[PDB]
Design a protein around this ligand. Structure first.
Ligand SMILES: [Zn+2]
Lengths: 114, 190, 124, 126, 288, 394
RNA sequence: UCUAGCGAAACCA
RNA sequence: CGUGGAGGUCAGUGACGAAGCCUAGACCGUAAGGUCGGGUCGAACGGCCUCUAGUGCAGAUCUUGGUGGUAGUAGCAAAU
RNA sequence: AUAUUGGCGAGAGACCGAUAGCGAACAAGUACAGUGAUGGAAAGAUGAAAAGAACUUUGAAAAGAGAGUGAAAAAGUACGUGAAAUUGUUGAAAGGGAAGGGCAUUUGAUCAGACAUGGUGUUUUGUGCCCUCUGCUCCUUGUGGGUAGGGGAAUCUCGCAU
């Protein structure tokens, strides 16, 4: 469907630029030119957790995790975890293209030689 | 006991169950037809069960009866599916006669998916692969960068170029008054 | 290009850091021998080092001494590399602070001298 | 696992035992396994190494090398074998400190203390 | 000995300090004695020699060994014929991006009778080889790009000639070069350096075959491939034959670095030579 | 040790006199006593196959289809030793047919075009005084070469086989008295076929053909490219009437070790994936682990037990492999010393390994200890080596 | 009195 | 939602690079935050169901450490 | 039979992991301060091996530069990793006694942006768990599972390849 986002930017603390010690996470203060988080900005329940590709992401550590997305190919998309070694990433890619599952992050820690 | 087993599996630890970022759950149960871990889905929570599943080449229908709740080695019954797609769906509807709609529907779906996966694997086996993947070790990459820097700094290539050009020039190889060299400068060489 | 470039590095140099920054900014982008003759004129108080940030033009001796020491070092390193002297001009120079105590404000001075390029007239 | 109470399995105690060991205990620690041939000779697997005997290297970067031990550097839990050295850029020589767990003894230097030790360990000593 | 941090650091720093004092005094005293006598200066420099890696390489019999049957092999596996110029074919790999097209456009001006194609899906290399034989192409060049960066080169001589896979590491465009220079239509001379091993002479004869012969002496242009430590460097330059006997340069076109990864017999048939990191760890062979 | 090396890049032979421990790569090592170039004929006509008859003559295979008998002398090198000097005595030409090969160049796995080569050069008879040798082409041409009584090579017959013949192995085990001449051959979609030829050498009879296996894990057809073969002793026990009595083993292209019992039948009862991803394999030699000589002069493994069979193969990369009868890798052989695709390997006398390939290096390896004995630089691509007698000069 | 050298602290939404 | 530790489990990840750091790189969350790319890096670490707490900081003229301006200024035993 | 923050020893920990934990993981009751009684710090990590940078050269000397070791000096006795505050240079932009952000958009710079390349039907030929005949074997004994030999596609038919 047509994904509505309701808020493109981020929600930052008041005076977060004014000091380097102050973080940028949302912390409630305890003018109105600051966008404050609230439940009205909560996205549509169908559209929630959707990539710009239109899938829901799913972290995959190994091939047995990849096989759990066998039936739900058009709905989900596999994302390789950040700490997977490069021997296993090519096996995961070959298995996923065999399964026909869209990998969100191919070409991670990998190159194509000859 | 099945609903007790189900509420143990649901409200406490199903070891096969995987939690998505969305909130949805996924059994890694090898017999589970859908990927999900729901009430109909867990093969552990249901004693009548069925599953399309492939052993090395051939696809088998796996049947689970409450009659064999004990003896889990003799639990699964195996049926060889036909290579005819229509005939094998007919075989599914035969062996799941007087059976519920969920198992027949998802079982046909899993069969179609596995057959199409077989088709794509045959395609990729026949597909030509020029490039192959290489992950590069950072140790190797750092040695490559630093040793290329050490080679370029070590070999002053420009001076050696000047050397070999003077070598070709004084050796001959350009004739008398070449177009490369000015005549006065060449006479200074001569 | 590392090939047509020599370098000189000085570390932990117990000098006033602010005066060294001024006299290093004064020397940037010059031919090496002209800059050295300029530094000799500084020692005779003939021409002064102009001060821009930390301030008018004084003659800070202790800075200029170490500067021309590094310039001699870079010239010797260029001649050991076998560069042209007349094409050789200082290209990069940087001073930054050394650690305070081992109240004083020492510094790390570095400079890169580079041959001037000359292009070739194209043929036909 | 650990059945006696008088045995302990603390990592901190074990490392404090290891690094603060006296030298007489160290030559017991500095032990090397014999060859298959020497096990066929004497019927015994591992022995405290000394310097007079001969050895081969079975691991490490200098794998498949051999020699007589120059000296046993017991203070560093290590052993300098002759002729396995790194030659520095001056031209001088410094041996690689090897470790006897990575060594296999080839030729023993037999002594009366050594022969009696083989006898007390059940050796079929010729 | 001492394992306190601040004591040990101080003591070793002072040992370094006294040592460098003594070394400065000793070199100054030797400098005075060699002011006096210029002989023992020479006796020192003949006595001790500065070790470098270029000085110390593992001996190879391939160095300074003549090639057996070099002319027949040279016409056979290489295009070395003044009668027959080469048809060179640019083969940029499937689903190429813009970067390899730019590099191919660069490589047009380097190589003679060069022909470009855009590869399409589903053409096997035997079929492409057969078509290039029917069109009498004598060598094909495959650009391997990745992540919008040109990473690999492949050279295949077509009459069952050998396959070469080079790894391109570092590339500089013409515009990022300071001493820019403008290249012209004139055919450059060529420089080959340090190809003295048998495999190195093979690669040198390869580049000698692929590059255009018969340079234009009028337009004083040259290209160069230097070998150092199994790293070959491509540059190109313009001549100033000075009165001062040192020729003057201006680096005209782009520069890059290549490294042979794979040398194979035939059209990807059997591999004569490969690169491995276990080859790299020895650090003194330098397979050229 | 004396070696004769077919040097491709010169198109010649080289005689090597070197002792055990000779390594040309190290100056400190032993250097070879004598290096001799011989019979340099250009790269278009390099030596393909050599057959040594006991000392005084050798048999050469050209790339021009010519088979050459060469007189071998010895003369003093002027540590003392004789060097060897070569003189061709007889030649039979015109034995290649590339017309079928360029005809079949479309249905071809390799990318290069196909040219004919002498794959097999050996006697037909296990008994000596044969004077009747065979020359097999890739074109399926099998030529019957007779040494004349005037000491002249004369061709007797030129029979055809199927197209590409990658290899042809003769069966020399038992009953040399009977006039039964069994060989096998195969190639690119050319099945392993057992053919008997008549002892009058005018007619052959295909006695057996293998059959392909069933479809794989992917239900795909398994490709057929056998690369090499050796024979064993036939089946013990009761013969089954009308099957055949032959047992033998083979190496494919696609990393399959295939064992064949004709008593079982035409399909493989045993086929093994040796390497992952169907890696190409080049040659196939058989060996005892203790360096013993357990084969025929044609190398056929003189046993009935497939589990006793141990093999050494090479890929088209730099690898040399050992395998058991089951496919378990016994080890890699000299993997740290070779850098080229070993074109040629050979078990000499059970206890030596002739290696030579694209590495321009002749490597005598030990069979049992798996240690390199001799490394020699030769300056040429190597495709064939014969090993003469061990000499241990000084 | 100038240069050179050395070189603070108070205080600091 | 996050943090240290604990029981179970994922025959979870990991020297073909864990953790950490940077990231004018991308993504998902209303947010707390989470996921990945790249760079650096060298040896451990995570997800889930539970347990447990020395469990979440901008301020307290808070404690300790580091670094500014003041300032080349004051000034010349302000420490030498 | 009981107490035991001391001694001599052990063995453990849902304890802390170098601003914590003892003041003290380190030459800590130390250096130091006090006339004294007393008070009392800071301070752990090169590397697997010092293999701790031969030699040349600048340089009073400190420090360099070539060179080399090392897997890594993007580990040089200032040394694991190396954040922020703050500093220097270069580039870009803005400013001329200019302060910051929020929205929205251009411009400039820049990045991402298929290893996508298939499906349906028909046809050709070939092959096999396709057909036929002859078997063997496991039990969960059925709407089963595995597996061999020879023959054939001449005809049909399925799958595969083409
Ligand atoms: Zn579940």
């Amino acid at each position: 469907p047509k994904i509505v986002k309701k808020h493109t930017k981020k929600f930052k603390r008041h005076h977060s630029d004014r000091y380097h010690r102050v973080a940028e996470n949302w912390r409630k203060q305890k003018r109105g030119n600051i966008s404050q988080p609230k439940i009205g900005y909560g996205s549509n329940k169908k559209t929630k957790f959707l990539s710009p590709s239109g899938h829901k992401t799913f972290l995959v550590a190994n091939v047995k995790d990849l096989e759990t997305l066998t039936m739900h190919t058009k709905t989900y998309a596999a994302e390789i975890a950040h700490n997977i070694s490069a021997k296993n990433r090519v096996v995961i890619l070959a298995r996923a293209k065999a399964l026909g599952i869209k990998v969100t992050n191919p070409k991670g820690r990998l190159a194509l030689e000859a | 006991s099945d609903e007790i087993v189900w509420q143990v599996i649901n409200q406490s630890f199903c070891s096969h169950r995987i939690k998505a970022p969305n909130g949805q759950n996924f059994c890694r149960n090898e017999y589970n037809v859908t990927g999900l871990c729901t009430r109909q889905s867990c093969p552990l929570a249901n004693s009548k069960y069925a599953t399309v599943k492939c052993d090395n080449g051939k696809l088998y229908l796996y049947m689970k009866t409450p009659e064999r709740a004990h003896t889990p080695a003799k639990l699964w019954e195996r049926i060889k599916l036909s290579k005819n797609y229509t005939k094998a769906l007919q075989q599914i509807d035969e062996h799941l006669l007087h059976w519920s709609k969920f198992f027949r529907h998802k079982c046909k779906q899993r069969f179609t998916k596995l057959t199409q996966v077989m088709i794509t694997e045959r395609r990729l086996a026949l597909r030509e692969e020029e490039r192959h993947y290489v992950g590069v070790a950072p140790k190797v990459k750092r040695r490559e960068q630093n040793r290329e820097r050490k080679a370029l700094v070590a070999a002053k290539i420009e001076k050696a170029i000047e050397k070999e050009l003077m070598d070709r020039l004084k050796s001959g190889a350009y004739g008398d008054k070449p177009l490369n060299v000015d005549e006065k400068v060449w006479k200074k060489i001569m | 290009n590392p090939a047509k470039s020599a370098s000189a590095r000085g570390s932990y140099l117990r000098v006033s850091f602010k005066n060294t920054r001024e006299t290093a900014q004064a020397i940037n982008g010059w031919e090496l021998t002209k800059a050295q003759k300029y530094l000799e004129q500084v020692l005779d108080h003939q021409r002064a080092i102009p001060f821009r940030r930390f301030n008018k033009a004084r003659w800070p001796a202790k800075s200029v001494k170490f500067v021309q020491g590094l310039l001699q070092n870079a010239a010797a390193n260029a001649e050991a590399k076998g560069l042209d002297a007349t094409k050789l001009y200082v290209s990069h120079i940087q001073v930054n602070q050394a650690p305070k105590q081992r109240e004083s404000s020492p510094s790390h001075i570095e400079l890169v001298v580079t041959e001037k390029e000359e292009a070739v007239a194209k043929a036909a | 696992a650990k059945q006696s109470l008088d045995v302990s399995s603390d990592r901190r105690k074990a490392r404090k035992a290891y690094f603060t060991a006296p030298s007489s205990q160290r030559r017991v620690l500095l032990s090397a396994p014999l060859s298959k041939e020497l096990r066929a000779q004497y019927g015994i697997k591992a022995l405290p190494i000394r310097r007079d005997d001969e050895v081969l290297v079975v691991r490490g970067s200098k794998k498949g090398q051999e020699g007589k031990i120059s000296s046993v550097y017991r203070l560093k839990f290590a052993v300098q074998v002759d002729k396995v050295t790194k030659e520095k850029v001056n031209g001088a020589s410094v041996p690689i400190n090897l470790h006897p767990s990575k060594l296999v003894i080839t030729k023993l230097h037999l002594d009366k203390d050594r022969k009696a030790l083989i006898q007390r360990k059940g050796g079929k000593l010729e | 000995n001492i394992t306190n941090k601040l004591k040990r650091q101080e003591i070793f720093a002072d040992i370094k300090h006294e040592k460098n004092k003594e070394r400065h005094t000793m070199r100054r005293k030797r400098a005075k004695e060699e002011r006096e006598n210029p002989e023992l200066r020479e006796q020192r420099l003949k006595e001790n020699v500065t070790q470098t890696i270029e000085n110390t390489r593992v001996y190879d019999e391939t160095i300074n060994k003549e090639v057996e049957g070099d002319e027949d092999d040279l016409m056979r596996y290489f295009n070395s014929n003044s009668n027959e110029p080469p048809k060179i074919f640019l083969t940029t790999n499937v689903n190429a991006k813009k970067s390899a097209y730019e590099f191919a456009n660069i490589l047009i001006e380097i190589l003679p009778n060069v022909t470009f194609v855009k590869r399409k899906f589903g053409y096997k290399l035997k079929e492409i080889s057969d078509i290039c034989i029917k069109r009498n192409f004598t060598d094909i060049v495959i650009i391997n790009e990745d992540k919008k960066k040109v990473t690999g080169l492949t050279f295949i001589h077509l009459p069952e000639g050998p396959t070469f896979y080079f790894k391109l590491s570092s590339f500089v465009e013409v515009k990022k070069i300071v001493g820019h220079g403008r290249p012209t239509s004139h055919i450059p001379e060529l420089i080959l350096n340090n190809f003295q091993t048998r495999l190195g002479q093979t690669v040198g004869r390869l580049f000698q075959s692929i590059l255009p012969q018969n340079p234009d002496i009028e337009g004083r242009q040259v290209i160069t491939l230097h070998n150092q430590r199994d790293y070959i460097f491509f540059r190109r330059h313009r001549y100033v034959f000075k009165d001062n006997e040192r020729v003057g340069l201006q680096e005209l076109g782009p520069q890059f670095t290549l490294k042979l990864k794979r040398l194979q017999r035939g059209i990807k048939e059997e591999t004569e030579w490969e690169h491995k990191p276990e080859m790299d760890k020895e650090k003194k062979k330098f397979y050229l | 040790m004396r070696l004769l090396v077919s040097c491709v890049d010169s198109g010649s032979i080289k005689e090597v006199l070197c002792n055990i421990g000779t390594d040309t790569s190290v100056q400190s090592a032993l250097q070879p006593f004598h290096v001799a170039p011989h019979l340099a004929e250009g790269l278009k006509a390099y030596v393909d196959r050599m057959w040594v008859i006991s000392e005084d003559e050798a048999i050469l295979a050209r790339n021009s289809g010519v088979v050459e008998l060469v007189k071998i002398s010895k003369h003093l090198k002027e540590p003392k030793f004789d060097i060897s000097e070569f003189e061709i005595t007889s030649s039979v030409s015109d034995l290649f047919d590339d017309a079928k090969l360029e005809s079949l160049s479309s249905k071809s796995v390799k990318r290069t075009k196909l040219v004919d080569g002498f794959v097999t050069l050996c006697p037909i008879k296990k008994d000596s005084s044969n004077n009747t040798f065979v020359a097999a082409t890739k074109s399926g041409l099998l030529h019957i070469i007779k040494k004349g009584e005037d000491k002249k090579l004369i061709k007797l017959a030129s029979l055809g086989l199927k197209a590409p013949v990658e290899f042809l192995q003769l069966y020399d085990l038992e009953d040399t008295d009977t006039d039964k001449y069994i060989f096998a051959y195969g190639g690119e979609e050319n099945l392993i076929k057992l053919v008997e030829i008549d002892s009058s050498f005018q007619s052959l009879k295909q006695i057996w053909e293998a059959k392909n296996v069933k479809n794989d894990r992917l239900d795909m057809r398994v490709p057929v490219w056998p690369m090499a073969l050796r024979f064993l002793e036939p089946s013990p026990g009761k013969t089954e009437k009308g099957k055949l009595n032959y047992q033998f083993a083979a190496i494919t292209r696609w990393s399959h070790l295939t064992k064949y019992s004709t008593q079982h039948g035409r399909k493989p009862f045993a086929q093994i994936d040796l390497l992952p991803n169907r890696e190409p394999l080049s040659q196939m030699e058989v060996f005892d682990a203790k360096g013993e000589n357990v084969v025929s002069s044609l190398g056929n493994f003189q046993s009935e037990t497939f589990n006793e069979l141990n093999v050494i193969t090479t890929d088209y990369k730099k690898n040399v492999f050992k395998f058991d009868g089951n496919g378990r890798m016994l080890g890699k052989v000299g993997r740290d010393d070779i850098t080229g695709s070993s074109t040629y390997i050979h078990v000499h006398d059970g206890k030596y390994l002739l290696q030579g390939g694209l590495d321009r290096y002749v490597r005598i390896f030990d069979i049992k200890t798996n240690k390199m004995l001799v490394k020699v630089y030769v300056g040429s691509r190597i495709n064939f080596i014969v090993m003469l007698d061990d000499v241990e000069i000084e």
